[PDB]
Amino acid sequence: VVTGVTA
Amino acid sequence: VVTGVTA
Amino acid sequence: VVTGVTA
Amino acid sequence: VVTGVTA
Amino acid sequence: VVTGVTA
Amino acid sequence: VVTGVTA
Amino acid sequence: VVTGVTA
Amino acid sequence: VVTGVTA
Amino acid sequence: VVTGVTA
Amino acid sequence: VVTGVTA
């Protein structure tokens, strides 16, 4: 599982 | 499991 | 498990 | 940038 | 930047 | 387990 | 920057 | 287990 | 910067 | 900077 949020 | 948040 | 937050 | 590899 | 490898 | 917060 | 390797 | 906070 | 290796 | 290796 990989979760990523970039902002 | 990898969780990442970059801002 | 890897958790990362960069700001 | 978030990079993740789970195995 | 977040880099993660889980095995 | 690795947890990291950089700011 | 957060780098993590768990095995 | 590695926990790190850098500010 | 946080670097972690757990094995 | 935090560096950690646990084995």
Swiss-Prot record, chains A, B, C, D, E, F, G, H, I, J:
Range of the intact protein held here: 70 to 76 of 140
Domain notes for this protein: The 'non A-beta component of Alzheimer disease amyloid plaque' domain (NAC domain) is involved in fibrils formation. The middle hydrophobic region forms the core of the filaments. The C-terminus may regulate aggregation and determine the diameter of the filaments.
Role this protein plays: Neuronal protein that plays several roles in synaptic activity such as regulation of synaptic vesicle trafficking and subsequent neurotransmitter release. Participates as a monomer in synaptic vesicle exocytosis by enhancing vesicle priming, fusion and dilation of exocytotic fusion pores. Mechanistically, acts by increasing local Ca(2+) release from microdomains which is essential for the enhancement of ATP-induced exocytosis.
Post-translational modification: Phosphorylated, predominantly on serine residues. Phosphorylation by CK1 appears to occur on residues distinct from the residue phosphorylated by other kinases.
Subunit structure comment from the entry: Soluble monomer. Homotetramer. A dynamic intracellular population of tetramers and monomers coexists normally and the tetramer plays an essential role in maintaining homeostasis. Interacts with UCHL1. Interacts with phospholipase D and histones. Interacts (via N-terminus) with synphilin-1/SNCAIP; this interaction promotes formation of SNCA inclusions in the cytoplasm. Interacts with CALM1. Interacts with STXBP1; this interaction controls SNCA self-replicating aggregation. Interacts with SNARE components VAMP2 and SNAP25; these interactions allows SNARE complex assembly and integrity.
Record protein name field: Alpha-synuclein
Disease: Genetic alterations of SNCA resulting in aberrant polymerization into fibrils, are associated with several neurodegenerative diseases (synucleinopathies). SNCA fibrillar aggregates represent the major non A-beta component of Alzheimer disease amyloid plaque, and a major component of Lewy body inclusions. They are also found within Lewy body (LB)-like intraneuronal inclusions, glial inclusions and axonal spheroids in neurodegeneration with brain iron accumulation type 1.
Similarity comment text for this entry: Belongs to the synuclein family.
Tissues of expression: Highly expressed in presynaptic terminals in the central nervous system. Expressed principally in brain.
Signal sequence, start to end: none
Subcellular location: Cytoplasm; Membrane; Nucleus; Synapse
Gene encoding the protein: SNCA
